[PDB]
């Protein structure tokens, strides 16, 4: 029922070489594993997001976000990754997001908790 | 268990006067609705997240995200919300985050699509 | 001169204990020097930036920024933040900002270069 | 002389064609001019920034930032942006930053008041 539900669903790859593997529902949830190419990860973690199921038509993208907790059956990095973005559909689909990452700090660490930054997905690796 | 699954699961409160009422899972899921005091929002949306179910131990905050998109059955903002923080608990609990909102755009305006804030949640008003 | 030349020059406090001493100029500019509480650094440190010197008069704020590059005469932490926000007057008037601290780094390392967090400065602190 | 100051300094261009002219001075000054190819904006306005003038001797990028606050003598869109990154010398030197574009607002719409993005700056116009 979603727009982009298929466009968005299947595997997807950033500059980095992380994967990303997402199931996009009909009610706006997306539900996947994300495997990291750096950092303190290994393997595959469990991810949750949402999407807008009926975008704008003017050929705007699609609204989406995810996040993953950094813990899973093998390491736990005591931090969280949400990416904020947008799916882009046509020959060459993108998700173009930008990231927050948070790990968990003493109240005196606080104010370098978070990183910023920004991921380009494609369908194929770059 | 989640260390911190009590802790967490209920009624959050920002300084917009924004409610988040979320259900941490054992397993690291966050599920449950957001409220928006301001924009382009009315009614509950659904909210999907994660958190560290096994935190440190050395007095460090719980890392923890969420996203919202802002679609429900009574309006349609094109946009969604990533909540990026940790929650700290005790007397005064508090989740403190630093979000990303970004809007479906063109590609050529595209570099106005995301808007960067923070907030902090409380269990008051 | 700025509109608000006067309401921004002086000294500032955030809520870290950091010292922010600045100067604004009718031309925009904003020269000064900031000393950190926290992180890879010790006395003083040159910053430079802008504002906005003929704002809107509906009541918003003014908007500003300026960059510090962590390296003076004792200390070298190969990074600089820059603080983008707005300066709002008043009976307690504020500089509310966000900001963005990069270190250098390694290509293979460029991921994790920059920092982000948020500034609320106080004339009293 | 600062190690990056010949590097740094001249005209650059980010991926959306604004330009972006640079003086890097010993001292850790950057002055120069920002044009914007989107957005309220018209012709050059004044930056002002500063850069480590001692990076490390690692390969590391070199750290730098600068604000432009948009108002100039055509136009004035109550804004100011900050751009914080790094220079990265050698075989197609870049200056890849990530920006804040902060407007002023009322007390009500503050939460509204911030845009983050990220440009990437090479010596060859797009
Ligand atoms: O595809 C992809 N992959 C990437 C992108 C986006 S997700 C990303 C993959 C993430 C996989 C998990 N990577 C771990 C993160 C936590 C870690 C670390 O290196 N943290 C940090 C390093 C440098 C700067 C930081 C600033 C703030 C906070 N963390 C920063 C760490 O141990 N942090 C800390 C431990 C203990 C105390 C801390 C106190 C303050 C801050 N950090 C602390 C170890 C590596 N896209
Ligand atoms: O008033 C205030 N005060 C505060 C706020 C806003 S300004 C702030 C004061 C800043 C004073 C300078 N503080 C130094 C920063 C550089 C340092 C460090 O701790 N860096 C980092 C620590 C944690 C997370 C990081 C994420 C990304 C990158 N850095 C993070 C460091 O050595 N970093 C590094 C060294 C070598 C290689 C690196 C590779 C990647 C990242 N960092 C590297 C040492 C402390 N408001
Ligand atoms: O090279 C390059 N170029 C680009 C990049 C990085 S710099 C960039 C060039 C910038 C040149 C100036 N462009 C003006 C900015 C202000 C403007 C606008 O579109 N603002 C905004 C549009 C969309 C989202 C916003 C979110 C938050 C705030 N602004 C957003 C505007 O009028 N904003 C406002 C007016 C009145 C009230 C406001 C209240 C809240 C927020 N904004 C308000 C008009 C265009 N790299
Ligand atoms: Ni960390
Ligand atoms: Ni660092
Ligand atoms: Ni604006």
Redesign the interface.
């Known amino acids: 029922m979603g727009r982009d539900q298929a466009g968005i669903t299947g595997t997807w790859y950033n500059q980095?070489g992380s994967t990303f593997i997402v199931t996009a529902g009909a009610?706006?949830?997306?539900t996947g594993t994300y495997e990291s190419a750096?950092?303190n990860a290994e393997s595959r973690y469990?991810?949750?997001?949402?999407?807008?199921?009926?975008?704008?038509t003017?050929?705007?993208?699609?609204?989406?976000?995810?996040?993953?907790?950094?813990?899973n059956n093998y390491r736990?990095a005591?931090?969280?990754?949400?990416?904020?973005?947008?799916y882009?559909g046509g020959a060459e689909a993108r998700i173009?997001?930008?990231?927050?990452?948070?790990?968990?700090?003493?109240?005196?660490n606080?104010?370098?908790?978070?990183?910023?930054?920004?991921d380009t997905f494609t369908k194929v690796k770059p």
Request: net charge negative; hydrophobic share 40%.
């Open positions: 980095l009610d706006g949830a997306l750096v950092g469990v991810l949750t997001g949402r999407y807008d199921s009926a975008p704008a003017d050929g705007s993208g699609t609204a989406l976000g995810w996040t993953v907790a950094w813990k736990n005591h931090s969280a990754t949400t990416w904020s973005g947008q882009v173009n997001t930008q990231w927050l990452l948070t790990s968990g700090t003493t109240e005196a606080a104010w370098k908790s978070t990183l910023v930054g920004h």
